[PDB]
Amino acid sequence: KLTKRMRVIREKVDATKQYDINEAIALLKELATAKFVESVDVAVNLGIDARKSDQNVRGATVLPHGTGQVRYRNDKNGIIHTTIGKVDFDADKLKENLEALLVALKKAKPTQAKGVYIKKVSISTTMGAGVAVD
Amino acid sequence: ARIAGINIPDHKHAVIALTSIYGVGKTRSKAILAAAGIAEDVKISELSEGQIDTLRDEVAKFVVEGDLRREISMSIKRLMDLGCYRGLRHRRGLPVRGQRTKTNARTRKGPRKPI
RNA sequence: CGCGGGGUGGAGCAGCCCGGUAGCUCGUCGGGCUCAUAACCCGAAGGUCGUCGGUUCAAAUCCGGCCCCCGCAACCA
RNA sequence: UGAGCCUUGAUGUGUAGGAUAGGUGGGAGGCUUUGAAGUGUGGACGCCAGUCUGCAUGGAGCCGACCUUGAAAUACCACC
């Protein structure tokens, strides 16, 4: 069923367990496997669900590294799927980019929000697997 | 196609297109084509919008379109101001010729209305 | 005060979850069938759903605010 | 035997459109004799439609950035 490309991707990423940013971004840079330059795809699930109307968030962020001005809006399943920048960008810079997005997200959090704000934070590339961030 | 009148006649049999034009009946259509001389039995070839130029001037002798409507409006407003029985039927949406109102006056009064 | 339920045609009740533009029951009015009445049958009208916002291509439907009613629990200036 | 929940596949049919357009993002490359649409064929969602699926045939082509369309390829990666 799975092709050799997909089985080697799941051999490279063991997503059943969580990872810290330094290891996660190293995996992302080694996950960069395509003819064309890929773009980082964010995979962050929020405990808060935009299913409550007042808990919706609209925000903006300017990134010095760039992608550099990005916008974001929560969907109904309460998930965040943005792009911090291109994959060839250095890991340490990419780690600062995602960190600034996360700090803006904490400002975006409403008081009405109940339970964990950020349920899980994960990273993936165009065809890459999801690596959890700690 | 277009004519001197504001409304535009359809491209089809010339007599039928004129019947459709407001103010000009089928018989009046035949009156001006008798003067114009344009019959449908002539060569269909060489037919153009330029040809109706003669139609523009001859129809203008007959009040049609807006001119007739203005006449209809002045005739009915006079009826209303006169205070005559004819005007009153116009005001109440009732038969204006003496037709029975008890039954069969739907076209004048309108849809059936519950008691 | 906390939690749960309800308000939709004159009335009553669905539809709600799982958004797809709203029905039924009974009544009303008109006709039919019958010697007549009921039953029955046909047609018609009636609210866009307690209200107000948000969301969305779109809300009775989903999430809040408010009003009223109800159930249970809570209440040592 | 119920619930939470891990994983695997399966499963979405308001509609102009080709069709069985659930929400979002990266996103013109995925795929490929080691078998492209499709066939036989066995079932599934079954709304009886699009797909998937034990094996074989086909011998390489598929999704199209064309249209339609709030909304696009639903090609490619995750969750609900």
Side-chain angles (χ1 to χ4, degrees), chain A residues 1 3 35-36 39 41 75 77 79 81 86 126-128:
Chain A
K1 183 188 58 180
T3 70
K35 320 176 183 302
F36 74 112
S39 181
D41 183 35
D75 66 343
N77 301 129
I79 328 199
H81 335 85
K86 281 304 186 174
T126 299
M127 213 170 47

Side-chain angles (χ1 to χ4, degrees), chain B residues 20-101:
Chain B
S20 308
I21 302 174
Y22 178 84
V24 182
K26 180 186 176 185
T27 80
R28 184 172 287 185
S29 169
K30 306 167 32 164
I32 63 170
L33 270 71
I38 171 167
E40 293 182 355
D41 289 342
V42 308
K43 289 296 298 178
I44 309 297
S45 62
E46 301 176 359
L47 187 58
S48 296
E49 56 176 356
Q51 298 289 335
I52 69 215
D53 55 355
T54 59
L55 277 296
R56 316 312 269 274
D57 56 48
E58 56 196 336
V59 67
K61 89 192 310 179
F62 289 120
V63 274
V64 281
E65 261 74 24
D67 303 345
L68 185 57
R69 292 182 172 97
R70 175 267 328 168
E71 177 64 33
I72 302 303
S73 303
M74 294 300 293
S75 80
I76 65 183
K77 293 179 179 179
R78 167 195 49 94
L79 287 175
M80 292 177 72
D81 195 28
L82 269 180
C84 59
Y85 167 88
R86 196 174 197 180
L88 275 168
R89 319 303 293 182
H90 273 295
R91 295 176 64 186
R92 308 158 181 177
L94 280 183
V96 202
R97 299 308 296 265
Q99 294 100 339
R100 37 156 65 254
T101 60

Side-chain angles (χ1 to χ4, degrees), chain A residues 26-45:
Chain A
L27 286 169
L28 188 122
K29 188 180 180 180
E30 183 178 2
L31 254 186
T33 46
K35 320 176 183 302
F36 74 112
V37 55
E38 317 182 34
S39 181
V40 182
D41 183 35
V42 181
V44 173
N45 202 191

Side-chain angles (χ1 to χ4, degrees), chain A residues 46-81:
Chain A
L46 301 180
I48 93 104
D49 292 338
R51 181 177 181 170
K52 288 193 183 304
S53 176
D54 54 357
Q55 282 174 354
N56 205 5
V57 285
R58 293 182 183 174
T61 301
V62 184
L63 280 322
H65 322 277
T67 296
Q69 189 174 252
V70 302
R71 208 181 178 180
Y72 64 91
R73 184 194 65 119
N74 202 10
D75 66 343
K76 293 179 179 179
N77 301 129
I79 328 199
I80 299 296
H81 335 85

Side-chain angles (χ1 to χ4, degrees), chain A residues 67-132:
Chain A
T67 296
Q69 189 174 252
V70 302
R71 208 181 178 180
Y72 64 91
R73 184 194 65 119
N74 202 10
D75 66 343
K76 293 179 179 179
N77 301 129
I79 328 199
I80 299 296
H81 335 85
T82 58
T83 154
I84 66 184
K86 281 304 186 174
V87 71
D88 292 332
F89 273 74
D90 289 345
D92 297 352
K93 307 187 312 179
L94 281 182
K95 147 179 180 56
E96 305 307 318
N97 194 311
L98 76 95
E99 180 59 46
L101 176 74
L102 213 42
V103 305
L105 249 55
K106 299 156 192 172
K107 308 164 191 174
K109 171 188 182 176
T111 168
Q112 188 70 30
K114 186 182 179 180
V116 195
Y117 171 54
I118 22 183
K119 191 163 38 185
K120 171 190 177 180
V121 174
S122 177
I123 48 179
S124 159
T125 69
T126 299
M127 213 170 47
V131 174

